[PDB]
Design an enzyme around this catalytic site. Sequence first.
Site, PDB file in Angstrom:
ATOM      1  N   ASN A 196       0.818  -1.213   0.000  1.00 43.92           N
ATOM      2  CA  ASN A 196       0.000   0.000   0.000  1.00 43.92           C
ATOM      3  C   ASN A 196       0.855   1.269   0.000  1.00 43.92           C
ATOM      4  O   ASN A 196       0.516   2.274   0.630  1.00 43.92           O
ATOM      5  CB  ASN A 196      -0.988   0.000   1.169  1.00 43.92           C
ATOM      6  N   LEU A 197       1.970   1.228  -0.720  1.00 43.69           N
ATOM      7  CA  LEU A 197       2.752   2.425  -1.012  1.00 43.69           C
ATOM      8  C   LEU A 197       2.326   2.915  -2.394  1.00 43.69           C
ATOM      9  O   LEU A 197       2.542   2.223  -3.396  1.00 43.69           O
ATOM     10  CB  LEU A 197       4.247   2.120  -0.944  1.00 43.69           C
ATOM     11  N   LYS A 198       1.707   4.098  -2.448  1.00 47.62           N
ATOM     12  CA  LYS A 198       1.054   4.567  -3.664  1.00 47.62           C
ATOM     13  C   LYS A 198       1.013   6.094  -3.698  1.00 47.62           C
ATOM     14  O   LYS A 198       0.991   6.754  -2.652  1.00 47.62           O
ATOM     15  CB  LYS A 198      -0.372   4.010  -3.777  1.00 47.62           C
ATOM     16  N   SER A 199       0.985   6.641  -4.918  1.00 45.28           N
ATOM     17  CA  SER A 199       0.919   8.076  -5.194  1.00 45.28           C
ATOM     18  C   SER A 199       0.880   8.281  -6.707  1.00 45.28           C
ATOM     19  O   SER A 199       1.064   7.340  -7.482  1.00 45.28           O
ATOM     20  CB  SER A 199       2.115   8.828  -4.599  1.00 45.28           C
TER      21      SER A 199
END
Lengths: 318, 486
Positions: free
Chosen positions: A101-104
Amino acid sequence: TYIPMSQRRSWADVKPIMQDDGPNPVVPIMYSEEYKDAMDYFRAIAAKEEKSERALELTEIIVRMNPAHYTVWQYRFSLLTSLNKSLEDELRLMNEFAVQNLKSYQVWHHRLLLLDRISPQDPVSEIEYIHGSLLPDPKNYHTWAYLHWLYSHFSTLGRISEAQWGSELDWCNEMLRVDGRNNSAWGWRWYLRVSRPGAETSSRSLQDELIYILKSIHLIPHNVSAWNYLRGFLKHFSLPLVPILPAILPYTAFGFPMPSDPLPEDTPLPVPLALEYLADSFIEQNRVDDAAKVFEKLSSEYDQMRAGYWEFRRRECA
Amino acid sequence: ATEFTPSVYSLVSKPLPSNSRPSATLDEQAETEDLISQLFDLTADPNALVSEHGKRYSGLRKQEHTQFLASSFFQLPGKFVSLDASRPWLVFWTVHSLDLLGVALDQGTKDRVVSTLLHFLSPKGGFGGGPANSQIPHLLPTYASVCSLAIAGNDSSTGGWKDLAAARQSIYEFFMRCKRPDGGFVVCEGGEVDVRGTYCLLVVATLLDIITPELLHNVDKFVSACQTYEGGFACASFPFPSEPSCRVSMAEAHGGYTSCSLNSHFLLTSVPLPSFPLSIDANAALRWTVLQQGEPIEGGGFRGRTNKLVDGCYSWWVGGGAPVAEELVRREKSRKVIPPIFNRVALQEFTLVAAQQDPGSTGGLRDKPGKRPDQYHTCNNLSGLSIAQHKMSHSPSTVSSNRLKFDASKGLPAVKPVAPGGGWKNEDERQNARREIWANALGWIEEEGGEIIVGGKDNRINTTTPVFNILGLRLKPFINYFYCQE
Ligand SMILES: CCC[C@H]1CN(c2cccc(OC(F)(F)F)c2)C(=O)CN1Cc1cncn1Cc1ccc(Br)cc1
Ligand SMILES: O=S(=O)(O)C[C@H](O)CNC1CCCCC1
Ligand SMILES: O=S(=O)(O)C[C@H](O)CNC1CCCCC1
Ligand SMILES: O=S(=O)(O)C[C@H](O)CNC1CCCCC1
Ligand SMILES: [Zn+2]
């Protein structure tokens, strides 16, 4: 226990550089020791323009703590290309960032830059990954935009086959079967069937598309996504509204799909966008008084949240 | 004035029908309808002369919201690190919200704001999301920093505007380095291409008098091709080669990208180039805008795209786009030759009843009930509330009076274009461009007698400007500084 970078043999040659905020900045953020330390050494690395494995490791540490750090992502990509690193390995790392859940914007754009530079002969593996990644959020805007870019970019290179386009529509049809209210999948259908440069326009394709739209409306009469697609479809192809009116009139109380003889339960009438269709078809017939009467009812009874808009349309009839 | 803006409490509240066809979208919609309608049920109708006993009072809790924002001028907790590359936005959301709330900063605090932002300015051009020794320039922090300096700065030697003026050529050069042949811009070196970048760039170029023909080439075409079959706009369009043979929108119509597209196109209509800007379908955009206002059971707030949930931040993105769409429709009605266009009352009720943090708590405004308030939703809820309270329109007679007072013999040095033929043809054309761009930027007015303050005059906030989203009393002296007017 955390080990400061000043105490690591691999970094002993590097003098860290402090953040230059001025003496008393507004909106300061209370940073963890690990994050401040890593950025102190990143400032030094970027100051000396070092392209190295330790710089690459440092950028990964930083974007794990802050995935939105566009400067460090930019530096990471230039490290990958300067060092001629395996971009397929990096793509496998991006698969993990999604999992954890590392997102951008920055992570999605990094993935696009990887695909652009790898330039695979066949992007089918990335297409399938994107499809699976829509499972936790089937309306993720970044993901749908990236899917549009992937097909557009690789079709410009001639690398999307007819079989591939065909299975993409199959997948799109299944998405709308699982949730007909997914407006993102309706947007994708529009690309696949209407707007992409290679789409077919024939009397068969227009007939097929109209059948799918009308069947979708009859399945979910209050689905705004289906009504908007119908209106965009007719407008885009300059098709008259009147010949289709038999399929729409039952919602305002011949070859193409008609509503169920008894309507589905929980379908209160009238459907406001059905009335909008009726008013516009009156206008197409130059029956402005009839159109005005429908707008007046939309304004005062059936769609009162938009009372002023529907009154504006009423007044335009005069 | 409220004949066509019925209160949510006066309408029958009913759920989105299912048609006997369940889906994940409908599960979330029904749960959100329950949340919002229950909170309206516990809250006294704002339109009542004496508030009901036993029910929550909905008045705008301005002092709570001021205290919520005050953390910006001391420190933010460690989980703010995800916004470490957006610190100019934290400034903007804070200082614009305080302007809207009518709260003055003292000069020492304004000076700290100016000084902090100038440390984000890099000598090669543009602001980053943090110190220039740490972050590269980015179009979005450049807009946020420029507008924040308009709000907190001044024309003295410590006011920051003098530094902006000296940076005009380098900022212009940064903008031209970002430019793509098809009319898009990357947001930063190696960054993504979308209409957020176009919007932020055009606002700044308009305010600082650095618009040239080479800067604007194909920018109108990129934006116009973002419009979708629904009538709103997507994030970007893709150029297919034989300049491009055609352009295709890349995702669904969205309230944020529709705001950016409408505002960008509106800024381009001031530019006197031949056959420029390529037109959009203004009627379809207005239709899409009004269709995103939610039903009474969802409190009359706006959603950001079809079949998703209402969210207070779209009060600005979608609601604040409505006067722009309305003006473009009016121009086309005029070219081919009165009631409010969205429910201005219901949007205020959503803001007061659903988007405020519950009383006696942190303060701040939020996406919807069940969500923590934050600086971004505080700013956007209040900016949209302002648009609903004050009837904004772009006035041709005001633009005409602006043309009559413009002094073309005053101004800052012309930018030097990147390419030899990239500038204006001569001084007559450049000065005509400066006049039109300045005069239209100052053309927005609040219509006398159009005010609607739901719940009484203590709920009134200040008037923001459509397109720029700063107060007119900030916009006028700021843009006058860079054009050397009055
Ligand atoms: C920290 C705020 C995040 C918020 C706003 N934000 C943004 C930030 C700076 C600038 C800007 O735009 C412009 F033009 F530079 F000012 C937009 C985002 O990127 C994503 N957002 C998430 C979100 C919240 N609630 C709806 N969303 C979707 C959404 C998506 C796109 C847009 Br546009 C608006 C809302
Ligand atoms: O809701 S707001 O207007 O922002 C601020 C709160 O009401 C503070 N209320 C105080 C309670 C004790 C007496 C003085 C006022
Ligand atoms: O002289 S300028 O180019 O305008 C300013 C500097 O070069 C940019 N600073 C870098 C930003 C990113 C991290 C490393 C430092
Ligand atoms: O100016 S008017 O609209 O006629 C009426 C006032 O604004 C009423 N504001 C309230 C007064 C009592 C405390 C809570 C606010
Ligand atoms: Zn939001």
